[PDB]
Ligand SMILES: *[C@H](CCCCC)[C@H](O)C/C=C\C/C=C\C/C=C/CCCC(=O)O
């Protein structure tokens with residue numbers, strides 16, 4: 001039973017990686033692009049980009065461990081542990097050439113360590129809508145003159161006593177609509193059906209727990225990245241960020257300038273956090289153009 | 298019916314103030330001291346301090362509007378609105394002499410405007426464990442490298458669509474144990490029996506909602522205080538803050554110096570947010586000594 005509709009010409013499949021059965025959706029022909037989703041979502045957030053990219057690339061969109069239909073990690077939820085699974089998954093399909101990487105929200109957290117540690121394996125990189133875990137996150141204000149901030153969920157999700165699982169269980173659909181819309185500029189892209197699908201997915205008890213275990217490991221990821229960041233990223237990089245409500249604005253490119261030698265960035269006016277859905281057409285175009293001056297079918 | 302045991306020699310009573318029935322506990326003889334509790338608790342947090350103060354003062358400990366056994370406010374939950382109720386209640390019992398004030402957590406928010414607008418009515422002032430609402434609160438971090446953000450609850454409680462009531466209803470006792478203990482250094486004083494008492498009270502639907510409405514009005518209170526703070530406090534003031542997990546440390550005194558000409562502050566080591574319970578002996582001593590520098594019975 002697929003949690004989300006698979007687009008035509010794609011297959012929903014599973015691979016075992018280090019004892020963890022990972023789910024992904026794959027299609028297309030050419031060099032590999034891996035698309036890594038973020039919190040609240042699954043591979044499905046890429047379902048509009050995937051058929052376009054599949055015209056020139058092999059496209060794979062895994063579910064993060066514990067989310068969607070992927071088994072939880074057996075090592076842990078820090079960025080360095082999770083990135084092992086995603087790197088080895090990508091290499092099962094592109095063992096002989098570098099692959100491209102596109103990540104959104106905690107997809108960044110779960111890929112940056114494998115990018116920095118295996119730079120020869122990464123052809124081009126696209127990061128959108130999340131800080132790389134480092135000391136900058138310790139500055140983000142808890143509360144704003146307009147009300148709730150964009151980052152208080154860090155502490156809510158990281159709290160112990162299974163605080164988030166316990167308060168959200170039985171209200172998963174309600175809470176998902178709230179945080180989607182509280183980080184959105186364009187809420188009308190989110191149908192009741194789409195919200196139902198996302199909510200059913202992360203409401204699985206192991207997926208609800210997995211969602212927050214990424215945040216309970218966030219400080220460990222920050223400490224890990226403090227060492228990894230001694231090595232600057234050398235591949236061509238693009239950042240994308242929303243310019244509207246929920247968007248990260250200039251922070252995305254400005255942070256990446258400290259990590260990457262070769263980086264260009266865009267801020268999308270009128271768009272919030274959920275770029276693949278709120279601003280599908282211009283985000284698809286920027287990603288496709290950026291990846292298509294590298295190499296492709 | 299009493300939500301909490303009234304100490305020997307005190308009366309539990311009610312008084313209508315501008316159409317709102319406020320509950321209070323009162324005892325002793327001499328000049329008046331009003332003790333104003335904060336979020337998650339009621340008049341009862343003062344129940345160990347009250348018999349000692351009552352040897353020298355008339356002591357009144359009201360329930361904040363909507364909390365404990367007091368009716369919700371009819372005007373609103375901003376600091377300036379709620380302070381009217383508390384000032385009028387005090388002045389019912391001390392119409393012709395200044396009175397003393399002790400306030401904890403959001404009891405500060407709900408008293409600071411009537412202090413600065415009626416400085417001749419306040420003989421001495423003791424504030425503990427809360428910022429006065431102003432622009433400084435917009436810089437407190439959402440997420441910390443160590444420990445936990447003390448202030449992320451600001452956005453949780455202020456989030457719209459009744460987010461906090463919807464998630465917490467039916468789980469009030471679990472949530473109260475979590476946020477009390479996470480803001481505590483000496484957690485062992487919060488026995489299940491004591492947590493049961495506090496949770497039964499704020500689980501009343503109108504009390505659970507009232508609790509969060511104080512935070513939904515926080516931005517308004519900040520705007521109110523920007524004008525009010527053009528006049529510094531002139532009466533003798535003392536600040537207390539915990540030095541341990543959950544405590545505000547030096548911030549309490551350092552902010553108060555911007556508001557008061559005559560202020561001394563204490564940081565209590567090994568004590569978190571809940572000073573009357575975690576550190577009863579040194580806190581009671583500090584308060585009694587400070588208020589007994591003035592006229593007492
Ligand atoms: C995923 C967010 C999911 C939203 C639902 C809970 C990650 O947990 C967070 C990624 C992005 C969140 C948005 C804001 C990041 C904060 C940066 C603000 C920078 C300010 C600036 O422009 O300088």
Ligand SMILES: *[C@H](CCCCC)[C@H](O)C/C=C\C/C=C\C/C=C\CCCC(=O)O
Pocket residue numbers: 335336337402403426427428436437438447448450476477480545548570
């Ligand atoms: C009552 C909170 C206690 C109940 C827990 C849910 C008020 O809402 C908050 C009062 C006291 C603690 C919060 C603020 C800390 C004040 C200054 C922060 C100094 C340093 C920093 O953390 O930024």
